[PDB]
Amino acid sequence: ATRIQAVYRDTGVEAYRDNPFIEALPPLQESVNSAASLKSSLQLTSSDLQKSRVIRAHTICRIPDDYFQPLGTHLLLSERISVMIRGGYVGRNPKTGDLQKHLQNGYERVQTGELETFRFEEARSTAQSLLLIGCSGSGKTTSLHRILATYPQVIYHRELNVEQVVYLKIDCSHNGSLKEICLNFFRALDRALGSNYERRYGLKRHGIETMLALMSQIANAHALGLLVIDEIQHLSRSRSGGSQEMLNFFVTMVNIIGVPVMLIGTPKAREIFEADLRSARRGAGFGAIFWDPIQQTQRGKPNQEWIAFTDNLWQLQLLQRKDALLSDEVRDVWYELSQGVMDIVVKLFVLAQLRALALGNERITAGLLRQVYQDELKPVHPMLEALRSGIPERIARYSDLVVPEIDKRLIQLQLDIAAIQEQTPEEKALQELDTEDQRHLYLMLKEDYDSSLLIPTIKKAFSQNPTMTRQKLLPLVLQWLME
Amino acid sequence: ATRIQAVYRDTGVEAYRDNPFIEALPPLQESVNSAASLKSSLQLTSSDLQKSRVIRAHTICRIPDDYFQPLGTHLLLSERISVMIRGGYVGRNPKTGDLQKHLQNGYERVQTGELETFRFEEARSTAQSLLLIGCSGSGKTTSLHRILATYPQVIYHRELNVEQVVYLKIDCSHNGSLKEICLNFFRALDRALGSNYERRYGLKRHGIETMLALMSQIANAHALGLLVIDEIQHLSRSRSGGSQEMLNFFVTMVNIIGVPVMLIGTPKAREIFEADLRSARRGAGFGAIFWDPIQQTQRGKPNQEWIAFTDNLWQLQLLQRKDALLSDEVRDVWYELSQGVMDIVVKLFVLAQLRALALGNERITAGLLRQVYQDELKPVHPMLEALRSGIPERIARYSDLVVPEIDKRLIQLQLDIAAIQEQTPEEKALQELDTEDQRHLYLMLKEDYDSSLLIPTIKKAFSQNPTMTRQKLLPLVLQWLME
Amino acid sequence: ATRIQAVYRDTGVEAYRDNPFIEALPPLQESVNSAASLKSSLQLTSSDLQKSRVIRAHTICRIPDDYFQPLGTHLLLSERISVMIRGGYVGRNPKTGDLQKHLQNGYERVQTGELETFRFEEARSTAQSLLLIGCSGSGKTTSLHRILATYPQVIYHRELNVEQVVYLKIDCSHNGSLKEICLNFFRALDRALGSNYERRYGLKRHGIETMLALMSQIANAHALGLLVIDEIQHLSRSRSGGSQEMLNFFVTMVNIIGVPVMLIGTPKAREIFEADLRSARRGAGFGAIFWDPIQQTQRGKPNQEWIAFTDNLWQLQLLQRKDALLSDEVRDVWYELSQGVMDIVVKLFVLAQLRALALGNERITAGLLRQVYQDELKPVHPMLEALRSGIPERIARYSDLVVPEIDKRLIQLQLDIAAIQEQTPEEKALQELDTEDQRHLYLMLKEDYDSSLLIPTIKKAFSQNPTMTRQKLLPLVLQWLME
Amino acid sequence: TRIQAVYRDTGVEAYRDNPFIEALPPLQESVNSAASLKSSLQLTSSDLQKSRVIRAHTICRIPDDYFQPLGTHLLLSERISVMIRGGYVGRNPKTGDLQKHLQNGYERVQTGELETFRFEEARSTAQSLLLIGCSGSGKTTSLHRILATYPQVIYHRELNVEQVVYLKIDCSHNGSLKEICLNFFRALDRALGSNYERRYGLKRHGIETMLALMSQIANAHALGLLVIDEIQHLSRSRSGGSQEMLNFFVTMVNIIGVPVMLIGTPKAREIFEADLRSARRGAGFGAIFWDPIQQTQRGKPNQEWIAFTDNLWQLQLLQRKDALLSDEVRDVWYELSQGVMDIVVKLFVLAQLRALALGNERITAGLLRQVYQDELKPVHPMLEALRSGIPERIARYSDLVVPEIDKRLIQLQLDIAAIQEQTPEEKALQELDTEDQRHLYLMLKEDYDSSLLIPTIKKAFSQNPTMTRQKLLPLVLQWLME
Numbered sequence A, B, C: 001a002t003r004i005q006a007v008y009r010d011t012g013v014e015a016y017r018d019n020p021f022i023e024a025l026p027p028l029q030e031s032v033n034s035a036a037s038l039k040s041s042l043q044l045t046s047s048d049l050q051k052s053r054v055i056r057a058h059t060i061c062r063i064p065d066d067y068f069q070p071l072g073t074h075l076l077l078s079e080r081i082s083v084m085i086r087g088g089y090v091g092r093n094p095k096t097g098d099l100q101k102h103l104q105n106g107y108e109r110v111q112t113g114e115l116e117t118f119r120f121e122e123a124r125s126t127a128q129s130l131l132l133i134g135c136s137g138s139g140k141t142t143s144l145h146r147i148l149a150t151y152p153q154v155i156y157h158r159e160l161n162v163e164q165v166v167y168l169k170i171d172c173s174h175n176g177s178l179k180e181i182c183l184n185f186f187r188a189l190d191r192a193l194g195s196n197y198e199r200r201y202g203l204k205r206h207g208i209e210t211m212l213a214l215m216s217q218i219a220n221a222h223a224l225g226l227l228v229i230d231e232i233q234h235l236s237r238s239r240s241g242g243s244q245e246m247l248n249f250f251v252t253m254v255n256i257i258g259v260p261v262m263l264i265g266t267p268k269a270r271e272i273f274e275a276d277l278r279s280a281r282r283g284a285g286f287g288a289i290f291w292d293p294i295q296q297t298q299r300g301k302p303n304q305e306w307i308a309f310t311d312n313l314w315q316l317q318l319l320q321r322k323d324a325l326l327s328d329e330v331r332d333v334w335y336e337l338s339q340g341v342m343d344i345v346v347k348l349f350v351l352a353q354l355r356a357l358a359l360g361n362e363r364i365t366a367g368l369l370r371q372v373y374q375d376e377l378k379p380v381h382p383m384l385e386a387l388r389s390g391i392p393e394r395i396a397r398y399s400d401l402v403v404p405e406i407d408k409r410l411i412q413l414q415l416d417i418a419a420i421q422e423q424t425p426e427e428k429a430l431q432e433l434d435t436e437d438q439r440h441l442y443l444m445l446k447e448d449y450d451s452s453l454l455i456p457t458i459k460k461a462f463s464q465n466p467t468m469t470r471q472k473l474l475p476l477v478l479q480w481l482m483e
Numbered sequence D: 001t002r003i004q005a006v007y008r009d010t011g012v013e014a015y016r017d018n019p020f021i022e023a024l025p026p027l028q029e030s031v032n033s034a035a036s037l038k039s040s041l042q043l044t045s046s047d048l049q050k051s052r053v054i055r056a057h058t059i060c061r062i063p064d065d066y067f068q069p070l071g072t073h074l075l076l077s078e079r080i081s082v083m084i085r086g087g088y089v090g091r092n093p094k095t096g097d098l099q100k101h102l103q104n105g106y107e108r109v110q111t112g113e114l115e116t117f118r119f120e121e122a123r124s125t126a127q128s129l130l131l132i133g134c135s136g137s138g139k140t141t142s143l144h145r146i147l148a149t150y151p152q153v154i155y156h157r158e159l160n161v162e163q164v165v166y167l168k169i170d171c172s173h174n175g176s177l178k179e180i181c182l183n184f185f186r187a188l189d190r191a192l193g194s195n196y197e198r199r200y201g202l203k204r205h206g207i208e209t210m211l212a213l214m215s216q217i218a219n220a221h222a223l224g225l226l227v228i229d230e231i232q233h234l235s236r237s238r239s240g241g242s243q244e245m246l247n248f249f250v251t252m253v254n255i256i257g258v259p260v261m262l263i264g265t266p267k268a269r270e271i272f273e274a275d276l277r278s279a280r281r282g283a284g285f286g287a288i289f290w291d292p293i294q295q296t297q298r299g300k301p302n303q304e305w306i307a308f309t310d311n312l313w314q315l316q317l318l319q320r321k322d323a324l325l326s327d328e329v330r331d332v333w334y335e336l337s338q339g340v341m342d343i344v345v346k347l348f349v350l351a352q353l354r355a356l357a358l359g360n361e362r363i364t365a366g367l368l369r370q371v372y373q374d375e376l377k378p379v380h381p382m383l384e385a386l387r388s389g390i391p392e393r394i395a396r397y398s399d400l401v402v403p404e405i406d407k408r409l410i411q412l413q414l415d416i417a418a419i420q421e422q423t424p425e426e427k428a429l430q431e432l433d434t435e436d437q438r439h440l441y442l443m444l445k446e447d448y449d450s451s452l453l454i455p456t457i458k459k460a461f462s463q464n465p466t467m468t469r470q471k472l473l474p475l476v477l478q479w480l481m482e
């Protein structure tokens, strides 16, 4: 964001009494009511129903990028992230103007023997950590770019010159080499503040240890609040080095830097972080958070969350004919097919809608859902089979599965509907004619007479009189044409 | 591109309310079917092919330069242009204060208590920089130079003192460097405005980083709508820093200016952006639409696009003894020799027609098309056969291949056609005929009967009316000759 | 941040005619009476002698910051500021055109018969730059902040859409660098106008030359009159660079911006510009106005400015036992203890009364001046010894010291002067009298006649005739006193 | 000055198809060549009745904006025009496809048809002009205004050449020969927009490497001239002597074209007065010597001196302005100044600047003598050297210049402005002679309106000669009553 100037509020918690950093943040919110703040959806009216199908295709393909329904887990995630972001500023207070005289007076008093004991310097260290482990397509990056986004970004302080970089989010590289996770940090920080940390610290040839030590020198001047490392699966066990080297790099990174680093990954990456007790102890600073796909029934009774989700997204459909009441057969087959993962349901919506408005029909049917499932979900069937089987031993084997290049498929469907339109009514007059002899006659007789009687008279002459040659058609055609 | 005084009206959507520069744009409601209104096609007359081979040659020569068939994909591109020009400027409203003022006011509201939770979402609306990628010769330049032509370049405002440059078309010159793109951006802006800036800006003391800021100042000053950086394929990657640094230049350029920008390139130039767009990030920007050649069959059915295009080009040829219909074998050879790209299609059709006129046999078939392809279209053979091969790696190898100086070859062959002096029977038919009016009688009554028994009987029996209509003269020829 | 609408007033000078930036400025014709309109002083009443000691001390505390004496140097500085500001605008006339069009037209004419001769010079007016050099404490800042406050800061034109920023001021800080001045430019511009230039064009990654170009074009987008840089001494000689690099940067800054730029410097800062000041060329500019301390000995006669200043300041005293007429010795001694630096003139005068209010008798004597000099003038002892020595090198090298933290000393003196329990005969004589006005007769008559029987006589007279003023009573009060 | 090129033909046969010469201002005859240099101040009649500070400010700008072209500026303008327009004929881009012509000549010369041919490669040397004259005679203000008729830069559309018509270089107060090659780049990247200083003028390069780098740049841009000014300011011990400073301006024959110009004092011509080498190359196009104006060249006084004196007289800003110049004042100028340009205008400016301070408001010969003896003290020996007429003394004292007279003008302006404070009511204090009167007034001013304090105290001291301070007060109050 931009340099939002600080406006101070007094948090009721005693431990945050004097910090400008904690008091410049948005106020504490109730965790029960904080879930409703994330909700967002598109706006629909009755006027847009009767519109060209290209604009409708655009406004229904924008659904997955602008629809977000808060779930049960969002409240816990928001609470944990708030505690992490506001609990790492206690030992990093800036206002210590009266420290020298206090410490010197205590030193004199304990030196003369008047005082029994005194504590000169204590500042607290070690950085908390948390991991958010879940399967791909479960909304770990859609729901964490909103909970983390209700906060501001870089905040300037008028009295000091420190700018409080509230958060920073980096993604791991495909090759996963550790020299690029320590190098994406500089670019992600440059794109926020607007500096040249890359040229000064990255292009220069420093070792991994030196480049890791320089990170804590620019993560201390600008009071970083959080550092989230995403797509840890790509870095996990790629061409980066040994597993011991990876684990020790993460341990040393958590130790050196003073900010609450968070890790996100697929359950395949759980095994490396449970390698030794040191890494498990450091990573599980606030326990662990695991994300489970939605079940159709909570405990025997049907899931209220499932009904609410596939009603609040059901009512977002844009079709000529749409029934408000959703049948239970569609719901049952939908839980059978999509298995509850959040990424596949919205893709099923958009794909089925595009195919329906391209094939002419204006209703979505369970048969259409099955057809789309067999048509354009081929790469994800191993993952969905693992989910539906209920055997978790090899779920992590296929948990990395993503639909490849689905966006280009969406663009191809949009191109197909745009190029197919609804019909070609201007060429229906030519479509009435079925013989090439009649086509020839119309072609030569196009300029002679108006097109109003070119089709009907020729068609009647060719139909009422069954067979003849091409040459003898024209005199009878003109004889009919005069009257 | 002249000076039009701004006139205001009401928009279809309230989201663009009261913005002066958006309102001054041409209205959106009247363009119900812009594809039909953009269909430019030269129409031949009944008797323009009158003993004048020069006129026919000029008419055929004008076809590659003055033929435009709008497909259904151009409707999608027009919709994207409209969305990008009308939805990416809502932030820069001169009536309101600024985005920063709104963000700070919302922060004050949420800190005080009036507003519950402000969403610091870095409000930028769409602001997506489309990446238009297609094979060379597909018609991208000729499509964006005509769809972006119903918009006046400079709409004027009298209330303020700002000139609105609605669109600016930048063409990257051959063997270009990374500085001359900014230089000719300035040149095009001066040409479209009339105020020089290169004298005080285009000085070699400044570096490329300074030119970017000087560009950003002018861009924010005039509130320009779109920027199109065309022909990235023609630049030189040797003089510049390289592919890795030009990507940095591009991302800095799109990020700093803040206006929507579109890039036009070849699949070979995709290699520059492969490192960025292939990364899984919906927030990374650089959205793309792929220009694919139209195919004969998709899912086993013949596409009507090829049929319509071939028919439309078929009715616009001038040949004395042409065949009215296009054979299935002829279309099969067309697809086997062109494979979908359109630039080779029009040049091949024109060259085949003129060669058939020149060599004395006028009927385009597999043999004549094969001869003209083996005689003139040999330099373009590699890529045409490569697209039939269909290997994606092979296409980008020779994607840049364009036939050299084909306009010079066109003028040379036009000069060469004048070398013929032999007389064809239609010359005798049109020379032994006296008057201007009766000339089309031979043209439209040649198929049924031969001229030797045609002309005497009809010239004797035309004496029913001294001023007979050429339109009304059909029946006598057929009815009085079979007797 | 003043926001005044412009109104156009005609100017009598021929060269100034028809220019809409110079007519909105305050009229030149009023300069005759505006030359000496800056006089200001505190007002003292005879009733302020009988008021309480602490509030008298508070009144004396405000002597330095509300007393101003116009000298001969302020006249010259005001004339030069007026000329520079109003003559740097003649070139930039937005109603007829710029320089380049005129030069091109003149060259076109001289290439033909018309306009036999032309002068290819520039109406640059030397781009006036003033290097105001003087010893610290001479009173430069608090005169440039009083002769530049008469002009409205932001004159806004409504026919056009530009804000005529008549003057903009840049200040310096401790241990400054070259880039800090450039950022302070945008800081001051945002403080004045209220725009947001700093956040979107004051990024940390920009170099000096890019920042210089950005400054040059932004200061021309808004009509700017003057760029004043104050306290160039505080720039650091180590972190920014050597003497040559600062000189080169300042020369580049003056040359590229275009508007007149004024510089405020100390004799040590003159060492930076020794090279260009020695170059006897006035085309570039860098004319120097030399501040000097107030020198009594002028052409073998005390400077009438010194006598006027010292008498005006001496009438501003509040003492119960004050001496009426200044003696030659008492003024002379604090002349050699003042050295003409006027900063340590008003400081000594305001400290003398505050110390004498507690040291004993209430009279400004030479001894208390001497003890103040030996006690609280320690930092500027070598300042003044260099000044009395008269060696140019010693006075040049020994400058910049400013007697830090006078405020704490003054307030401590007020707290200490509060706690005096003893009442002098002057103060205890008050309680015997009753009305506050009637002590005026006592003050007029205490020194010349014995007061012990005088004050009963005052009671007698006022009690005998209550309802008459002091002036009516005075002759009869005297005749009762003596006769 | 990036002026685009417009070509006009010229009457000379040698400038037929030359872009560089035809893109220049047209040839101007001898008559109107001097009228374009003239400049004078306006000084309308409304300026006479003004404030003294603004009038002194206007007076302190007469030398800056007053130029009277004499009879010796026309010759210099003509020679500069010939020098600029004659050094381009060998550098013109008017060359067709010479390869075919040269090959044809080569094939024809060896078969006996043509006896001889000419395969030309290089032509012409650098013309040098040695303009030397006494310091203070005006060799720079009479050169800037002559060069100000030509545009500095010209841009050609068909080609890609920026014809930098001239370039002026200044020498430092104590500089070697290595500080003349840095000034070239530092002035060329200012005349144009470039960065030659940080690219070519490094520290590693020697004198010869930079002197050879200058030629490539002076031929990339068709540099029409190069003026080196104040050779006198070079130090003869930091450079090498009079044989490494004489050889350095002779080795500037290797610079292609660019007809250089050298300006110096008759004591800096001792560098070139060691041989004919720079008496031939340096005097390759003449050697013009400035001569101060002589009052009587013939029996009749010359027109130059009287015209200059009159046209300087008409710019007086004085309330009591003398209508006509008198003969005695003119003779005083000629005796005191001896014809030096920098001294006549300086005497006039300082005289009418002191007239304001002393309040006389008239220019007198005694005032001229006073200001000459007061201010122009260091440049006396030059004046007696000129008066005696011995060339040795004149050459010995030809670097004498007034040191830092701008500062002296600043204190003069300050002194004029310091007088301006005059207040009528303080004439009471002037009337307030007796200290007892001051004591009485300071006490009694607040009691009664200050209007009648003056007459009351004046009457009190007039009627009674002496009395104690105490008894004066009842009588003063009695007078205030009546």
Ligand SMILES: Nc1ncnc2c1ncn2[C@@H]1O[C@H](COP(=O)(O)OP(=O)(O)O)[C@@H](O)[C@H]1O
Binding pocket: A063, A064, A065, A066, A067, A068, A069, A070, A071, A135, A136, A137, A138, A139, A140, A141, A142, A143, A342, A343, A346
């Ligand atoms: N609660 C939700 N409601 C609606 N859509 C969701 C929800 N959670 C996730 N999605 C959708 O899932 C899609 C992909 O999420 P993604 O970023 O791939 O998560 P992850 O990276 O953890 O797999 C997003 O486009 C988003 O629209």
Ligand SMILES: Nc1ncnc2c1ncn2[C@@H]1O[C@H](COP(=O)(O)OP(=O)(O)O)[C@@H](O)[C@H]1O
Binding pocket: B064, B065, B067, B068, B069, B070, B071, B134, B135, B136, B137, B138, B139, B140, B141, B142, B143, B342, B343, B346
């Ligand atoms: N809609 C269209 N109808 C017919 N021909 C077209 C159409 N669009 C493009 N073309 C053909 O494409 C050719 C120009 O292609 P061009 O725009 O240069 O491709 P690129 O932008 O890849 O270089 C023209 O000769 C034209 O005949």
Ligand SMILES: Nc1ncnc2c1ncn2[C@@H]1O[C@H](COP(=O)(O)OP(=O)(O)O)[C@@H](O)[C@H]1O
Binding pocket: C064, C065, C067, C068, C069, C070, C136, C137, C138, C139, C140, C141, C142, C143, C342, C343, C346
């Ligand atoms: N002409 C003046 N009239 C009245 N006070 C002055 C004058 N010049 C200086 N002063 C006093 O000197 C004090 C310090 O001046 P300062 O701003 O430090 O000057 P500088 O910045 O040139 O050192 C101010 O408090 C001011 O009251």
Ligand SMILES: Nc1ncnc2c1ncn2[C@@H]1O[C@H](COP(=O)(O)OP(=O)(O)O)[C@@H](O)[C@H]1O
Binding pocket: D062, D063, D064, D065, D066, D067, D068, D069, D070, D134, D135, D136, D137, D138, D139, D140, D141, D142, D341, D342, D345
């Ligand atoms: N022909 C002239 N007419 C009027 N003033 C002149 C003339 N020549 C010189 N001056 C005055 O002499 C002053 C200094 O001359 P300058 O050329 O600097 O001396 P030098 O030739 O020694 O460098 C200039 O300010 C100018 O006003």
Ligand SMILES: [Mg+2]
Binding pocket: A140, A141, A231
């Ligand atoms: Mg993810």
Ligand SMILES: [Mg+2]
Binding pocket: B140, B141, B142, B231
């Ligand atoms: Mg193109």
Ligand SMILES: [Mg+2]
Binding pocket: C141, C231
């Ligand atoms: Mg100051």
Ligand SMILES: [Mg+2]
Binding pocket: D139, D140, D230
């Ligand atoms: Mg000189």
